[PDB]
Copies of this chain bind each other. A is one copy, B any other.
Amino acid sequence: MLVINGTPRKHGRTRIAASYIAALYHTDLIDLSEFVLPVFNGEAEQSELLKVQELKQRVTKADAIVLLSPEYHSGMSGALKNALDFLSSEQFKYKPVALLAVAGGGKGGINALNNMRTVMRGVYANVIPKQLVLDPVHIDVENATVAENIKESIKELVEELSMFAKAG
């Protein structure tokens, strides 16, 4: 199982959620805060840089992926989209994915999720129905860990994810 962090900020609330999941479930983690690539420009050499082929590998290797991204202007992080512009259906096709967005509370989050969904569906991925949104109240920035009150949600999300993974 793979976990991708969307927040390009080394000190982001989304980064915490990523670490939690990837850790507590022992999964391959790709923190976009440190794992940084160049802004896609569509050029052969680029599609063969350093981190680029590693990204394509780790993604096309995981059975199921847990995609996390913060809501930036009612959409996923420009960082996460840029990294996705390097990949394609060749690494996501029919691959089980579980969307999870981190917003600043309120009604935020839904637009981010739908964005990630529409894009994932475009690369023929398989987004599971169950989706989650983490507000600041769900993140304990104090001890860089998710608040207990949400651990239950996250559980069944990943749990439902694996369910789809085994099915097909």
* Contact A78/B39 with A72-B85, A111-B122 known, Cβ cut-off 8 Å: yes
Size category of the A interface is: 20 to 34
Report the separation of the CA atoms of residues A82 and B7 in the bound assembly, to the nearest whole angstrom: 12
Any chain B CB within 8 A of the CB of A136?
no
Any chain B CB within 8 A of the CB of A128?
no
Please tell me how many copies of the chain the complex holds.
Answer: 2
A79 with B82: CB separation less than 8 A? yes
Any chain B CB within 8 A of the CB of A143?
no
Near B by CB (< 8 A), chain A positions 1-59 give 8-12, 33, 36, 39-43
Any chain B CB within 8 A of the CB of A138?
no
Any chain B CB within 8 A of the CB of A81?
yes
